[PDB]
C-alpha cells in the first residue's frame, strides 16, 4: 500500500508539511513527578526534568500509542491537518473564459531579469501558450 503509492501530488503535499529539522526535544527526560509534587528530594542530582507539565486540558497531553499508530483521533495529526488545510492556495476564478496567469517576482530589468525564452521553456511544458507578454 505504501511501498507502491504513486500520488506524486500527495507526496508533494506531505513533503511541504513534514518537519525538515530533526526535533530533538522529544528525547529529553520525563518531567519529575516529585517536582510536580513540589518535593524533589534529589535536587540537582535528579535526571528527570524539573519543569511545567503540559496542561491536562490540552489534547496533546492525552495520547495513546494505538491511536498514534493506527492513525485515529491523533491530537498532533489534527493540529497538523488543520494548519495545512488553512494554508493559502491558488484556485481558478469563476470566470471560465479567463485563461491568463499573472507571473511576478521576476526581479528588475537587466541580468537579473528572466528572458522570454525562460518562461517559454518552463511553461510550454504544460500546454499551448497562445501569447506571452513580458513586462520587464
Partner 1 sequence: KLRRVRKSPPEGWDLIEPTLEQFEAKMREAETEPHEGKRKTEINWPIFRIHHQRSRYVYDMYYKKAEISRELYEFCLTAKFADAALIAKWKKQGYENLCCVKCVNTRDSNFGTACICRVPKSKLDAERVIECVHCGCHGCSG
Partner 2 sequence: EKGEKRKRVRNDDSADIDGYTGPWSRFIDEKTVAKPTPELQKQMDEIVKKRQEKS
Partner 3 sequence: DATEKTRMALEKIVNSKVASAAQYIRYTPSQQNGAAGSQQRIIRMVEEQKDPMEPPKFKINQKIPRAPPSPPAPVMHSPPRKMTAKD
Feature table: binding site: 32, 40, 46, 50
Binding mask 26-45 for partner 1 (x = CB under 8 A): ----------------x-xx
Instruction: Please give the C-alpha separations between residue 59 and each of 38, 54, 55, 70, in angstroms, as whole numbers.
Output: 25, 10, 9, 18
* DSSP one-letter code for 28: S
Binding mask 3-42 for partner 3 (x = CB under 8 A): -----------------xxx--------------------
Dihedral class, residue 73 (left if φ above 0, else alpha if ψ from -120 to 50, else beta):
left
- Of 15 and 41, nearer to partner 2 (C-beta) is 41
Nearest approach, Cβ of residue 21 and partner 3 (Å)? 7
Residue with cell 485563461: 99
97 binds partner 3 (CB under 8 A): no
Q: Rounded distance, CA 106 to CA 118, Å?
A: 11
32 binds Zn ion (CB under 5 A): yes
Amino acid at each position: 500500500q505504501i511501498a507502491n503509492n504513486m500520488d506524486q501530488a500527495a507526496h508533494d503535499r506531505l513533503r511541504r508539511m513534514g518537519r525538515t529539522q530533526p526535533y530533538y526535544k522529544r528525547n529529553a527526560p520525563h518531567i519529575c513527578s516529585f517536582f510536580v509534587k513540589g518535593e524533589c528530594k534529589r535536587g540537582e542530582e535528579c535526571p528527570y526534568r524539573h519543569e511545567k507539565p503540559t496542561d491536562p486540558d490540552d489534547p496533546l497531553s492525552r495520547q495513546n500509542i494505538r491511536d498514534r499508530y493506527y492513525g485515529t483521533n491523533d491530537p498532533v495529526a489534527e493540529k497538523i491537518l488543520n494548519r495545512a488545510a488553512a494554508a493559502p492556495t491558488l484556485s481558478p476564478p469563476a470566470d471560465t473564459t479567463i485563461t491568463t496567469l499573472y507571473i511576478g517576482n521576476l526581479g528588475p530589468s537587466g541580468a537579473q531579469q528572466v528572458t522570454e525564452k525562460d518562461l517559454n521553456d518552463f511553461f510550454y511544458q504544460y500546454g499551448d501558450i497562445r501569447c506571452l507578454r513580458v513586462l520587464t
